[PDB]
């Protein structure tokens, strides 16, 4: 069904869907709710409706995502990470800032504090931008006929890399092993790191009467 709690989730087979209202206090008079629609094989479909207004209009309110569960392995031993994601978005009125992005967290050990974050931004609506120390892209890389600009930034004690798409990608199909291999070869990512989390979801800033529907989502680690 549909659940509106702050930390509530739905654990299905080989998938977990969160609401993650982790910064709801930064805004006033907002709400959000996520729900799963159909699960079949390795494909999951879901939706997320929200309405956030006012408050700190320059902060992420939530990261309602659909994460994958897998046996943690080092980046060396990962052969391929196939992924697909088809989504549609429906906002209304004006002053709409949001984001759609993959998040991959890697650390030194199997269960450790997140040392490296890799975000893949398939859409940047209304001024949403990645973390960047200099505010400027540091690499331009093409993976599978998809262009990306790479940003590097600090998050406490974590290094965040960001691949922002040059154009909006509403239908994505790729192998994320290429991104990690590029990062290890050029950007200095250690190859012995353990990939602990892989997920994808939205990140609203300010939006009224908004709803995002993921018609299909798949991921695996080989």
């Amino acid at each position: 069904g549909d659940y509106c709690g702050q930390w509530d989730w739905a654990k299905s087979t080989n998938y977990i869907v969160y609401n993650n209202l982790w910064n709801k206090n930064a805004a006033a008079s907002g709400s959000q709710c996520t729900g799963v629609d159909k699960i079949s094989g390795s494909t999951i479909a879901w939706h997320t409706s929200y309405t956030w207004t006012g408050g700190a209009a320059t902060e992420v309110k939530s990261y309602s995502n659909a994460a994958l569960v897998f046996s943690k392995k080092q980046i060396k031993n990962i052969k391929s990470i196939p992924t697909k994601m088809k989504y549609s978005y429906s906002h209304s009125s004006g002053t709409f800032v949001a984001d759609v992005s993959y998040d991959l967290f890697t650390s030194s050990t199997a269960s450790g504090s997140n040392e490296y974050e890799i975000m893949i931004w398939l859409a940047a609506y209304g001024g949403a931008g990645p973390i960047s120390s200099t505010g400027k892209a540091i690499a331009t890389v093409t993976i599978g006929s998809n262009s990306f600009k790479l940003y590097k930034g600090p998050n406490g004690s974590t290094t965040v890399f960001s691949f922002v798409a040059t154009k909006t990608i509403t239908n994505f199909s790729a192998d994320l092993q290429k991104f990690l291999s590029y990062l290890t070869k050029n950007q200095g990512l250690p190859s012995s790191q353990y990939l602990i989390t892989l997920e994808a979801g939205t990140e609203p800033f300010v939006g009224t009467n908004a709803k995002m529907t993921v018609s299909s989502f798949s991921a695996a680690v080989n």
Binding site: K11, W22, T58, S113, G129
Partner: protein, 696 residues
């Protein structure tokens, strides 16, 4: 001032743009806003009225893992051509209609400044820009532009600055075109593909001479010294070189030394520098900035300091972190003008000694994540420090008594060290905003003298020491702590009394203290924004049913291993960990139903709870581990227990009972018939993993 034509033109330009974050709100046709000069971004002339500056530029504000900019979306109207005397035009961060640069910009006939950098312009650069004869500053960097012909540059004979970074650069003869600008000083060509387009010696020979000062050549896959050698045709006038993120794999070029007037060298984020600064340095004499971060230098630190000996009186910032440097930090105060020094995450196995007395101007220092030994130096030799991080080292000895002479310190982190004691001067800091001395072997007792004058302390972290904290009665604390982290610290036989005047604190970890007193009456209400409450392994007694009032920020409640008694406290609507084992509670737990709870871990084992389990567990589907063992429950189990699809553990033994995937463990011993969960929202966006080493 404010001739009506300019006001009409500016209003027409406003009409096209679609502002959404309050910008341009000062503009309007209302009689109250008639005067043009007072508008934001509009500057006029004193004698005449035609405006001189139009600076509608924005800035980035950044959060945990995102940044935002109030970009102006709209159409750039041609009515700006009514600005016949304009010379400043800065529309940088706004994203307009993501199309080609407007052509009418070439017809301003008085422009002297133009900054369209970091907008979302695309397409070819307009060819009419040859009409901008009077331009001096031109910034068009980091847009999705395509540049393959630079024939328009030859007619622009007044530039002192040209930024063309972040473009699909394909001009094979760019050096010849750039050289045609006699007065060029600073050149920005970062993020271009300059690796594929290296100038030839013949065309460098067939060129004029122009005195460049600052070079910003970053984000090109150079990877060798043979692809950027051309910049050594500028040794006479070079003053700043920025060569970061170039995947350089080799020795730093020896010709970087002997570059007179050099003041800013950036070589951060390379592949392998293989020895760091060579012997060619020490001839610099004017260096003021040197960033060699994350480059795998593998250099001996005293060798680097002796090779940087030329710029002792001028070097200000020295970033040398995320490298692999070994040795001992000796004689750092001989650098008169040093203000920042970063040496995080190295293989420094040495000492931190001064061995001679001279003051230092360092304001920022961090030596964390190393293997440094020995005692701390006389910290009174660093009077102007503002931050000081020395965590994860092997430092020993007491903190020197001069620590109280800083008078400007804001952060002091000495965690994960083998420090033995704390001095009495710690109170006289008066501007410390955070103090972390956790995981040290700290002995002795801390009286109020150590805390006498910290009127700005917000963070107190003395976790896991042999320390003691006894403050005299009738003491009025001068600080309002927001995080209180004092585990395994002897806070006294009685409940601490300095907590009465403490408000507005987010977490409270006073567990493993030796409190042997009942809950005081004055401790009746926690602050509204309380987040973490841990009172485990104490001897506190009383009733907590009147202490938890369902705040909206609760995440962790740990009142285990105490002498609490009474009805079960109200469970917060957003709590996640709820540990209450080893106490003396009693009664039914029917009050776990009236509100929806997002708890992921609750433990009620080793109490005297009796009665029947409520058939209301559908209201808490977030449960992972459930423990009701060693209690005195009775009656049939609720069928709603089958609705906890997220359960991973269910311990119910030593009871009097009668009568869901991922349930790894199912213990139902007696009753007459390592696991790891996730607490999300701990480190802001990041989650935290909690391991439950449950018994069997």
């Amino acid at each position: 001032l404010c001739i009506e034509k300019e006001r009409d033109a500016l209003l027409e330009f406003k009409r096209g743009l679609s502002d959404n974050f309050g910008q341009l709100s000062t503009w309007g046709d209302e009689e109250d806003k008639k005067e043009c000069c007072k508008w934001k971004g509009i500057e006029c002339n004193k004698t005449t009225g035609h405006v001189i500056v139009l600076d509608l530029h924005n800035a980035f504000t950044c959060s945990a893992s995102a940044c935002f900019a109030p970009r102006l979306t709209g159409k750039l109207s041609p009515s700006l051509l009514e600005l016949e005397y304009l010379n400043f035009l800065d529309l940088s961060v706004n994203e307009f209609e993501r199309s080609e640069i407007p052509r009418f910009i070439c017809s301003f006939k008085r422009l002297e400044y133009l900054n369209l950098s970091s907008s979302f312009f695309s397409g070819l650069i307009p060819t009419q820009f040859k009409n901008l004869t009077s331009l001096r500053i031109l910034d068009l960097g980091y847009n999705n532009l395509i540049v393959k012909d630079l024939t328009w540059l030859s007619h622009l004979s007044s530039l002192e600055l040209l930024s063309l970074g972040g473009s699909d650069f394909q001009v094979k003869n760019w050096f010849q075109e750039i050289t045609k600008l006699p007065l060029l000083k600073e050149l920005d060509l970062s993020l271009c593909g300059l690796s594929k387009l290296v100038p030839s010696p013949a065309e460098i020979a067939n060129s004029s001479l122009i005195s460049l000062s600052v070079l910003h050549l970053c984000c090109n896959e150079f990877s060798s010294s043979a692809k950027y050698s051309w910049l050594f045709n500028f040794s006479t006038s070079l003053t700043s070189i920025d060569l970061s993120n170039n995947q350089l794999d080799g020795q730093i070029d020896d010709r970087f030394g002997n570059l007179m007037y050099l003041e800013h060298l950036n070589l951060a984020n390379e592949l392998n520098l293989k020895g760091g600064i060579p012997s060619s340095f020490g001839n610099l004499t004017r260096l003021r900035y040197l960033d060699m971060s994350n480059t795998r230098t593998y250099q001996w630190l005293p060798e680097l300091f002796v090779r940087l000996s030329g710029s002792r009186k001028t070097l200000e910032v020295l970033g040398l972190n995320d490298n692999s440097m070994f040795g001992s930090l000796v004689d750092v105060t001989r650098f008169s003008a040093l203000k920042r020094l970063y040496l995080q995450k190295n293989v420094l196995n040495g000492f931190f000694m001064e061995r001679f007395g001279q003051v230092s101007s360092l304001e920022y220092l961090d030596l964390s994540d190393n293997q440094m030994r020995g005692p701390l130096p006389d910290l009174a030799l660093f009077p102007s420090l503002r931050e000081l991080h020395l965590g994860s080292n092997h430092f020993n000895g007491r903190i020197p008594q001069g620590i109280g002479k800083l008078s400007q310190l804001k952060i002091l982190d000495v965690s994960s060290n083998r420090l033995e004691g704390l001095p009495e001067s710690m109170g006289q800091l008066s501007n410390l905003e955070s103090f972390d001395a956790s995981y040290n072997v700290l002995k002795g007792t801390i009286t109020e003298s150590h805390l006498s004058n910290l009127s700005s302390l917000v963070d107190l972290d003395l976790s896991f020491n042999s320390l003691a904290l006894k403050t005299s009665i009738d003491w009025l604390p001068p600080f309002q702590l927001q995080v209180i982290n004092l585990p395994s610290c002897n806070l006294g036989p009685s409940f601490p009394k300095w907590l009465q005047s403490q408000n507005n604190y987010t977490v409270l970890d006073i567990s493993l203290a030796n409190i042997s007193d009942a809950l005081p009456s004055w401790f009746s209400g926690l602050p509204p924004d309380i987040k973490i409450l841990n009172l485990s392994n104490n001897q506190i007694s009383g009733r907590v049913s009147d202490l938890i009032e369902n705040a909206y920020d609760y995440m962790v409640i740990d009142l285990s291993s105490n002498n609490f008694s009474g009805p079960l406290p109200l469970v917060p609507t957003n709590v996640q960990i709820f540990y209450l084992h080893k106490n003396q509670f009693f009664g039914s737990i029917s009050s776990i139903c009236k509100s929806t709870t997002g708890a992921t871990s609750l433990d009620l084992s080793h109490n005297q709870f009796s009665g029947e389990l409520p058939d209301c567990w559908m209201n808490a589907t977030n449960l992972a581990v459930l423990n009701l063992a060693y209690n005195n429950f009775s009656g049939k189990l609720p069928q709603s227990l089958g609705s906890l699809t997220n359960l991973e553990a269910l311990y119910m033994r030593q009871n009097s009972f009668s009568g869901c995937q991922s349930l790894q463990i199912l213990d139902l011993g007696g009753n007459k018939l390592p696991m790891e969960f996730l607490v999300q929202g701990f480190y802001g966006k990041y989650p935290r993993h909690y391991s439950y080493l449950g018994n069997l």
